Design a protein that fits this description.
The complex is a heterodimer of chains A (80) and B (201). Chain A is an all-alpha fold and 80 residues long. Chain A has one domain. Chain A is 56% helix and 2% strand. In chain B, a hairpin with a 5-residue loop joins strand 4 and strand 5. The longest helix of chain B is centred in the N-terminal third of the chain and has 13 residues. Chain B has one domain. The chains are: A mainly alpha (80), B alpha/beta (201). At the A-B interface, strand 1 and helix 2 of A face strand 5, strand 6, helix 3, strand 7 and strand 8 of B.
């Protein structure tokens, strides 16, 4: 009677621990092995700012820089 | 080893783009512009399709990735990317969405669908490098020889704190030391919030 209640409590504890562990994995990987388990973050208390025209303009300058310097990040073909 | 290392650089990815059920006209327009970024992507109308039936068919046909676009009250709100056969799955929220027709100075005319270059800027953490790997492998590999000199299209991902600005441009090399960009769209901000090690059911 009192020990089936304990089963449900332990179920809640296990579920809360699983959430906590997935959040700690996210936090740790975002600091600079660390990429082997599920990770999540709840950004709840943060809005996302609008992107100013200044920022989009500097992105354009970044792109021109990369093109003229030949600095590209896609995967390159290889032989198996 | 990871989920990408065996085939990375050897095969072109085969990507499927789709939406939640009953998509708004805005979500449909966004899904076409998302599709256009990915030269080896097909787009499947969601119809009445049940997601487990969709995932199983894509698995059967040996597709490599699914991109699923979600919305709320008529606005695109999230993107789910899942790599086949067995993971990983990335989810991110969507913000500041701007379609091509609403971008000042966006190209008009046809967009050539050459294999694009990619630019990843500012992913200075293991989490950031994991996201780059997931995104990068949605695009086919390019020939390394004279790569730095060829091409005419680029998709750009710029990470600042926890958000990623995404852009899509064609360009003309007007001289050895000058380039003109023409923006294709869409614009949007992506904020990753989950990376799990498996796939969709």
């Amino acid at each position: 009677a009192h020990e089936r209640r304990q089963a449900k409590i332990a179920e809640q504890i296990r579920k809360l621990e699983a959430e906590l562990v997935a959040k700690r994995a996210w936090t740790l990987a975002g600091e600079a092995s660390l990429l082997g388990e599920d990770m999540e973050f709840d950004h709840v208390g943060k809005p996302v700012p609008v992107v100013t025209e200044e920022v989009s303009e500097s992105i354009e300058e970044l792109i021109k820089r990369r093109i003229l310097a030949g600095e590209f990040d896609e995967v390159l073909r290889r032989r198996p | 080893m990871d989920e990408y290392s065996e085939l990375s650089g050897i095969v072109d990815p085969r990507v499927l783009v789709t939406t939640s059920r009953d998509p708004s006209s805005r979500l449909m327009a966004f899904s076409k512009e998302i599709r256009l970024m990915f030269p080896t992507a097909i787009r499947l109308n969601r119809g009445n399709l049940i997601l487990p039936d969709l995932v199983m068919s894509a698995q059967r046909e040996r597709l490599s990735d699914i991109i699923l676009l979600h919305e709320h009250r008529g606005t695109p709100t999230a993107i789910t990317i899942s790599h086949f056969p067995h993971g990983p799955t990335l989810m991110a929220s969507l913000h500041n969405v701007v379609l091509r027709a609403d971008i000042p100075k966006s190209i008009k005319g046809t967009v050539s669908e050459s294999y694009p270059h990619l630019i990843f800027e500012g992913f200075r953490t293991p989490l950031g490098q994991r996201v780059v790997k997931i995104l990068k492998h949605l695009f086919p590999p390019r020939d390394p020889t004279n790569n730095a000199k060829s091409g005419n299209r680029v998709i750009t991902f710029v990470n600042q704190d926890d958000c990623i600005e995404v852009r899509h441009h064609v360009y003309v090399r007007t001289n050895y030391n000058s380039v003109e960009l023409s923006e294709v769209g869409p614009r949007f901000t992506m904020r990753p919030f989950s990376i799990t090690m498996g796939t969709l059911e």
